[PDB]
Design an enzyme around this catalytic site. Structure first.
Site, PDB file in Angstrom:
ATOM      1  N   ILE A 158      86.067  32.790  91.138  1.00 47.54           N
ATOM      2  CA  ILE A 158      86.390  34.028  91.807  1.00 47.54           C
ATOM      3  C   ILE A 158      85.353  34.461  92.870  1.00 47.54           C
ATOM      4  O   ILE A 158      85.608  35.383  93.694  1.00 47.54           O
ATOM      5  CB  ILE A 158      86.611  35.149  90.778  1.00 47.54           C
ATOM      6  CG1 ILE A 158      85.418  35.251  89.869  1.00 47.54           C
ATOM      7  CG2 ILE A 158      87.850  34.878  89.952  1.00 47.54           C
ATOM      8  CD1 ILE A 158      85.318  36.615  89.325  1.00 47.54           C
ATOM      9  N   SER A 212      80.843  34.578  94.113  1.00 49.35           N
ATOM     10  CA  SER A 212      79.395  34.401  93.991  1.00 49.35           C
ATOM     11  C   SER A 212      78.665  35.530  93.318  1.00 49.35           C
ATOM     12  O   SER A 212      79.132  36.684  93.240  1.00 49.35           O
ATOM     13  CB  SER A 212      78.775  34.217  95.358  1.00 49.35           C
ATOM     14  OG  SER A 212      79.252  33.021  95.938  1.00 49.35           O
ATOM     15  N   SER A 269      74.156  36.314  92.160  1.00 46.16           N
ATOM     16  CA  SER A 269      72.831  35.830  92.477  1.00 46.16           C
ATOM     17  C   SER A 269      72.658  34.477  91.832  1.00 46.16           C
ATOM     18  O   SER A 269      73.037  34.266  90.701  1.00 46.16           O
ATOM     19  CB  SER A 269      71.776  36.814  91.995  1.00 46.16           C
ATOM     20  OG  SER A 269      71.958  37.107  90.639  1.00 46.16           O
ATOM     21  N   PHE A 270      72.118  33.532  92.571  1.00 41.64           N
ATOM     22  CA  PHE A 270      71.822  32.215  92.009  1.00 41.64           C
ATOM     23  C   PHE A 270      73.009  31.463  91.410  1.00 41.64           C
ATOM     24  O   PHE A 270      72.798  30.599  90.567  1.00 41.64           O
ATOM     25  CB  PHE A 270      70.757  32.306  90.906  1.00 41.64           C
ATOM     26  CG  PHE A 270      69.489  32.972  91.330  1.00 41.64           C
ATOM     27  CD1 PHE A 270      69.197  34.272  90.911  1.00 41.64           C
ATOM     28  CD2 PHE A 270      68.579  32.318  92.147  1.00 41.64           C
ATOM     29  CE1 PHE A 270      68.016  34.910  91.305  1.00 41.64           C
ATOM     30  CE2 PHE A 270      67.397  32.953  92.538  1.00 41.64           C
ATOM     31  CZ  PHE A 270      67.119  34.251  92.113  1.00 41.64           C
ATOM     32  N   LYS A 290      78.992  33.475  84.981  1.00 41.65           N
ATOM     33  CA  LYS A 290      78.222  32.979  86.132  1.00 41.65           C
ATOM     34  C   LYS A 290      77.437  31.725  85.807  1.00 41.65           C
ATOM     35  O   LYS A 290      76.662  31.676  84.849  1.00 41.65           O
ATOM     36  CB  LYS A 290      77.260  34.039  86.639  1.00 41.65           C
ATOM     37  CG  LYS A 290      76.624  33.698  87.979  1.00 41.65           C
ATOM     38  CD  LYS A 290      75.734  34.846  88.472  1.00 41.65           C
ATOM     39  CE  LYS A 290      74.537  35.015  87.578  1.00 41.65           C
ATOM     40  NZ  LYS A 290      73.520  35.846  88.242  1.00 41.65           N
ATOM     41  N   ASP A 328      68.935  45.039  93.561  1.00 41.62           N
ATOM     42  CA  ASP A 328      70.057  44.654  94.399  1.00 41.62           C
ATOM     43  C   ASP A 328      71.316  45.499  94.141  1.00 41.62           C
ATOM     44  O   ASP A 328      72.430  45.008  94.250  1.00 41.62           O
ATOM     45  CB  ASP A 328      70.343  43.154  94.240  1.00 41.62           C
ATOM     46  CG  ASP A 328      71.192  42.583  95.402  1.00 41.62           C
ATOM     47  OD1 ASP A 328      71.149  43.142  96.525  1.00 41.62           O
ATOM     48  OD2 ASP A 328      71.913  41.579  95.193  1.00 41.62           O
TER      49      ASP A 328
HETATM   50  O1  LIG Z   1      74.450  37.776  86.509  1.00 45.47           O
HETATM   51  N1  LIG Z   1      75.523  38.109  87.359  1.00 45.47           N
HETATM   52  C1  LIG Z   1      76.595  37.955  86.781  1.00 45.47           C
HETATM   53  C2  LIG Z   1      76.861  37.474  85.349  1.00 45.47           C
HETATM   54  C3  LIG Z   1      78.534  37.557  85.213  1.00 45.47           C
HETATM   55  C4  LIG Z   1      78.970  38.058  86.579  1.00 45.47           C
HETATM   56  C5  LIG Z   1      80.264  38.334  87.133  1.00 45.47           C
HETATM   57  C6  LIG Z   1      80.314  38.833  88.605  1.00 45.47           C
HETATM   58  C7  LIG Z   1      81.478  39.103  89.388  1.00 45.47           C
HETATM   59  C8  LIG Z   1      81.451  38.681  90.940  1.00 45.47           C
HETATM   60  N2  LIG Z   1      82.681  39.014  91.512  1.00 45.47           N
HETATM   61  C9  LIG Z   1      82.988  38.769  92.927  1.00 45.47           C
HETATM   62  C10 LIG Z   1      82.326  37.473  93.407  1.00 45.47           C
HETATM   63  C11 LIG Z   1      82.406  37.313  94.969  1.00 45.47           C
HETATM   64  N3  LIG Z   1      83.790  37.613  95.421  1.00 45.47           N
HETATM   65  C12 LIG Z   1      84.424  38.851  94.785  1.00 45.47           C
HETATM   66  C13 LIG Z   1      84.297  38.783  93.243  1.00 45.47           C
HETATM   67  N4  LIG Z   1      83.597  39.607  90.618  1.00 45.47           N
HETATM   68  C14 LIG Z   1      82.727  39.640  89.186  1.00 45.47           C
HETATM   69  C15 LIG Z   1      83.199  40.111  88.053  1.00 45.47           C
HETATM   70  C16 LIG Z   1      82.236  40.497  86.984  1.00 45.47           C
HETATM   71  C17 LIG Z   1      82.748  41.023  85.752  1.00 45.47           C
HETATM   72  N5  LIG Z   1      84.085  41.199  85.492  1.00 45.47           N
HETATM   73  C18 LIG Z   1      84.967  40.835  86.485  1.00 45.47           C
HETATM   74  C19 LIG Z   1      84.544  40.258  87.844  1.00 45.47           C
HETATM   75  C20 LIG Z   1      79.127  38.991  89.319  1.00 45.47           C
HETATM   76  C21 LIG Z   1      77.880  38.712  88.730  1.00 45.47           C
HETATM   77  C22 LIG Z   1      77.810  38.257  87.417  1.00 45.47           C
END
Ligand SMILES: O/N=C1\CCc2cc(-c3cn(C4CCNCC4)nc3-c3ccncc3)ccc21
Length: 264
Positions: free
Chosen positions: A16, A18, A20-21, A36, A129
């Site tokens: 879905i 990006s 961090s890292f 992630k 961030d």
């Molecule tokens: O540590 N960071 C983490 C750990 C899990 C995690 C999940 C997400 C996350 C990133 N997206 C974006 C990515 C770029 N395009 C649009 C969608 N959507 C989510 C999301 C998170 C939780 N529930 C539903 C969706 C981001 C960071 C981390």
């Protein structure tokens, strides 16, 4: 008690985007999860470090406004697992599909985002961030602050970056204060429905001028029924000098008060 998850158990689905890292997937582990993954081929000591830091910070959080950490995996790949939020980032609502929230709802999002930041700082966690991409609207009525890859106890965001942070003036520009600034810019996003500096098409020009203090968000743009107190809190949070910014307890009280006065 440990939060490690035995290889084989998490089922990775949709890519879905990006974080961090690493790369974020929707997945299944005792239900829907976000995963992630920090990895492929074998981790750098870089990535290994990032992953260990982030799991370390996450397991210090337990609060409705912090995205819930559920566990981690090392064995197919470095992987962090959290609750799945149905809905999206505050960023996606505001700037991609142009959801139009009511003031009452905007103030609530601000209040819960405040509530989480206040929790984190009380536990000495600096997010470093905060930005509307890392604020997830779960079931559309509940804010979860996510992504702790950069938190403390080929990449740049910057629209939420305080001037001190922009001009890396020493080892440590970061502080509760710089977090408070980023929050200031998401108050700006909530109230104007817009990203700052929208009339400058040059990224470099923005980085520079915020750095030197020539540029700062045009608070005129705050929609007309933004309460005065909110416009006033935004400007406190956005102060160029970090020592003039309020901490989150204060910020929180200010938002809860202007909300009590608001349904009128
Ligand atoms: O540590 N960071 C983490 C750990 C899990 C995690 C999940 C997400 C996350 C990133 N997206 C974006 C990515 C770029 N395009 C649009 C969608 N959507 C989510 C999301 C998170 C939780 N529930 C539903 C969706 C981001 C960071 C981390």
């Amino acid at each position: 008690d440990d939060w490690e998850i035995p290889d084989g158990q998490i089922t990775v689905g949709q890519r879905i985007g990006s974080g961090s890292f690493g790369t974020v997937y929707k997945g299944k582990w005792h239900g829907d999860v976000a995963v992630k993954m920090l990895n492929v081929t074998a981790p750098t000591p870089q990535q290994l470090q990032a992953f260990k830091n982030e799991v370390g910070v996450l397991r210090k959080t337990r609060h409705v406004n912090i995205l819930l950490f559920m566990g981690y995996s090392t064995k197919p790949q470095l992987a962090i697992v959290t609750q799945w939020c149905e809905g999206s980032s505050l960023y996606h609502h505001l700037h991609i599909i142009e959801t139009k929230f009511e003031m009452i709802k905007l103030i609530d999002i601000a209040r819960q985002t405040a509530q989480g930041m206040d929790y984190l700082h009380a536990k000495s966690i600096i997010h470093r961030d905060l930005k509307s991409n890392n604020i997830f609207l779960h079931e559309d009525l509940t804010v979860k602050i996510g992504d702790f890859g950069l938190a403390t106890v080929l990449s740049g965001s910057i629209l939420w970056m305080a001037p001190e942070v922009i001009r890396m003036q020493d080892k440590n520009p970061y502080s509760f204060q710089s977090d408070v600034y980023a929050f200031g810019i998401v108050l700006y996003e909530l109230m104007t429905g817009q990203l700052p500096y929208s009339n400058i098409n040059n990224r470099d020009q923005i980085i520079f001028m915020v750095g030197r203090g020539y540029l700062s968000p045009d608070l005129s743009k705050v929609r007309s029924n933004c309460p005065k107190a909110m416009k006033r809190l935004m400007a406190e949070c956005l102060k160029k000098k970090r020592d003039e910014r309020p901490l989150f307890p204060q910020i929180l009280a200010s938002i809860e008060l202007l909300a009590r006065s608001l349904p009128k």
